[PDB]
Amino acid sequence: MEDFVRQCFNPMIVELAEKAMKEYGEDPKIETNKFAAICTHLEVCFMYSDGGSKHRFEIIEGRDRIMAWTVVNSICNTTGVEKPKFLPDLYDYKENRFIEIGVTRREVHIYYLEKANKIKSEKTHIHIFSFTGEEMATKADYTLDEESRARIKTRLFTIRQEMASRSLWDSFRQSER
Amino acid sequence: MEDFVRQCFNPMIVELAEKAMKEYGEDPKIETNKFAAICTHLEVCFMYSDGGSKHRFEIIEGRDRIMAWTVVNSICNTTGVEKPKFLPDLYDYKENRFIEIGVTRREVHIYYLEKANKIKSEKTHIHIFSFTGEEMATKADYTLDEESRARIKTRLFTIRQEMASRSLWDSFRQSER
Ligand SMILES: O=C(O)c1nc([C@@H]2CCCN2C(=O)COc2cccc3ccccc23)[nH]c(=O)c1O
Ligand SMILES: O=C(O)c1nc([C@@H]2CCCN2C(=O)COc2cccc3ccccc23)[nH]c(=O)c1O
Ligand SMILES: [Mn+2]
Ligand SMILES: [Mn+2]
Ligand SMILES: [Mn+2]
Ligand SMILES: [Mn+2]
């Protein structure tokens, strides 16, 4: 599974995931499933910010803590939108809202409720994806066009198939909570 | 001059410049001219990467050292281009070359020679801008279109005028070497 991650994900995503795990005392060599989950979530967030017009989204995930809050606070001062208690993943300049992106191996509705009642913030938009092709967003507002969401859902589908071909999918799908 | 920097530059550029100065033992409150020079160089590099087609440029400046070399090494493994000895500022996916960007207050030809004989690498492309409107590149290959270079040269012109209106230009133009 470790060799699959460094093979199907770019070195920039792999390095970001390795730093996030080591910041919590986890070895990517041992918790290889969470290693892949972080890479997958990072890849989806980067594809999400490329699926609209130019400069429509500001990336917050992947940045270090100080720069991430520098971007968040700069937006709240310029646009007046409320400041989130936790770091979101994107900001929609067109819709004037923060975006939280989730990638689940289980069911898409369980992850939305778990992330909605955990974020608590009324303004932050939520958009969940899954490896089987489902997606659900806040109030059915999927932000992106059907073509940009299709390449994200197809990308997750391709990842699921490659690990299934490598007999790594069921161990990955199982270890989510 | 310190109040001008935090006013005319976004908080993301200001925070990046403050970190770069503190990594060398310099206080942005005292060396305010180098504080502005770092912000200006960062702003030009970010506008440069927005002046072509989407995904035409990869940003290397502004990243921390580990991520910057992660991007550089990933490009040298994917495209086979030679690995630079020093971190460049951008990579041109269309031209398959690294880009070094310079912003000088003096003359544009002195800065090109000083940066050419210092980089020594034959493949790295050089592109210098100035606050008065001059620009020169490697072998007259300016990479960008005249419209994208115009908004960069106009931006530097606007910066020069605001500090001149604040009686800060001549102290800034003088402290370059
Ligand atoms: O998309 C998501 O599900 C998502 N979830 C989070 C949650 C809730 C807030 C904190 N947190 C973390 O995961 C912190 O990191 C670790 C938490 C626990 C164990 C970890 C082990 C290795 C690496 C990171 C870890 N934070 C988001 O920014 C986000 O996008
Ligand atoms: O554009 C350019 O002129 C440009 N110049 C450089 C030069 C040469 C390589 C090192 N270096 C530095 O400036 C390092 O930082 C400090 C060097 C010295 C003093 C400093 C004080 C405060 C903050 C940074 C400082 N490096 C580029 O990446 C680049 O883009
Ligand atoms: Mn996140
Ligand atoms: Mn997320
Ligand atoms: Mn540089
Ligand atoms: Mn430079």
Tell whether the torsion through CA atoms of A75, A80, A81 and A86 is positive or negative: positive
What is the token pair recorded at A149? 């969401």
Q: Would you name the residues of B annotated as active-site residues? A: 115
The Cα-based distances of A133 to A108, A110, A157 in angstroms read 10, 15, 7
Partners of residue B59 on adjacent β-strands: B90
Resolution attained, angstroms: 2.5
Answer whether A74 sits within 8 Å of B50, measured CB to CB.
no
Pocket of ligand 2 contains residue B41 by CB under 6 Å: yes
What is the token pair recorded at A70? 């520098």
According to DSSP, the β-strands at A97-104 and A90-92 are antiparallel
If you measure CA to CA, which chain A residue comes closest to B68? A12
For residues A77 and A70, the answer to whether their CB atoms sit within 8 Å is no
For a mutational test of ligand 2's pocket, the pick from B100, B106, B128, B176, i.e. the residue with the most ligand atoms closer than 8 A to its C-beta, is B100
For a mutational test of ligand 2's pocket, the pick from B27, B39, B41, i.e. the residue with the most ligand atoms closer than 8 A to its C-beta, is B41
Q: Give Cβ neighbours of residue A126 (< 8 Å, ≥ 6 apart).
A: A99, A100, A102, A112, A115, A116, A119, A137, A138
Within 8 A of B67 by CB-CB distance, chain A residues are 12, 15-16
The Cα-based distances of A141 to A48, A54, A155, B126, B138 in angstroms read 14, 20, 21, 45, 48
Measured CA to CA, the distance from residue A117 to residue A17 in angstroms comes to 26
Question: What residue type is assigned to position A89 of the chain?
Answer: D
Which experiment gave this structure?
Answer: X-ray
Measured CA to CA, the distance from residue A130 to residue A150 in angstroms comes to 12
Q: Which of B16, B50, B70 lies nearest to residue A15, judging by beta carbons?
A: B70
Pocket of ligand 2 contains residue B87 by CB under 6 Å: yes
Contacts 24+ apart (CB under 8 A), A160-165: A160/A131, A160/A132, A162/A4, A162/A8, A163/A1, A163/A4, A163/A36
Distance in Å, CA B45 to ligand 6 centroid: 8
DSSP A40-73: HHHHHHHHHTTSSSTTSEEE-TTS-HHHHHHHHH
Q: Which of B10, B55, B64 lies nearest to residue A74, judging by beta carbons?
A: B10
Pocket of ligand 2 contains residue B89 by CB under 6 Å: yes
Query: In CATH, what number does B1-177 get?
Result: 3.40.91.90
Pocket of ligand 1 contains residue A24 by CB under 6 Å: yes
Query: Preceding residues of all breaks in chain A (C to N beyond 2.5 angstroms)?
Result: none
Measured CA to CA, the distance from residue A159 to residue A8 in angstroms comes to 8
Partners of residue A128 on adjacent β-strands: A102, A136
Q: Which of B12, B64, B74 lies nearest to residue A11, judging by beta carbons?
A: B74
For residues B137 and B92, the answer to whether their CB atoms sit within 8 Å is no
What is the token pair recorded at A52? 């609209």
Q: Which of B125, B133, B126, B169 is nearest to B151 (CA)?
A: B133
Answer whether A11 sits within 8 Å of B73, measured CB to CB.
yes
Residue having the nearest C-alpha atom to atom 5 of ligand 2? B102
Residue having the nearest C-alpha atom to atom 2 of ligand 1? A102
Q: Which of B56, B20, B57 is nearest to B38 (CA)?
A: B20
Contacts 24+ apart (CB under 8 A), A140-146: A143/A52, A143/A92, A143/A95, A143/A99, A144/A48, A144/A51, A144/A52, A145/A51, A145/A52
Answer whether B15 sits within 8 Å of A66, measured CB to CB.
yes
A101 is in an annotated binding site: yes
Domain ranges of chain B: 1-177
A61 is in an annotated binding site: yes
Rg (CA), chain B: 16
Residue with tokens 């990579």: B91
Residue having the nearest C-alpha atom to atom 1 of ligand 2? B102
Measured CA to CA, the distance from residue A22 to residue A131 in angstroms comes to 26
Helix locations, B23-176, DSSP H = 32-48, 65-78, 108-119, 146-165, 169-174
What is the token pair recorded at A63? 């940045």
Distance in Å, CA A128 to ligand 4 centroid: 9
The Cα-based distances of A37 to A20, A33, A159, B153 in angstroms read 12, 6, 11, 44
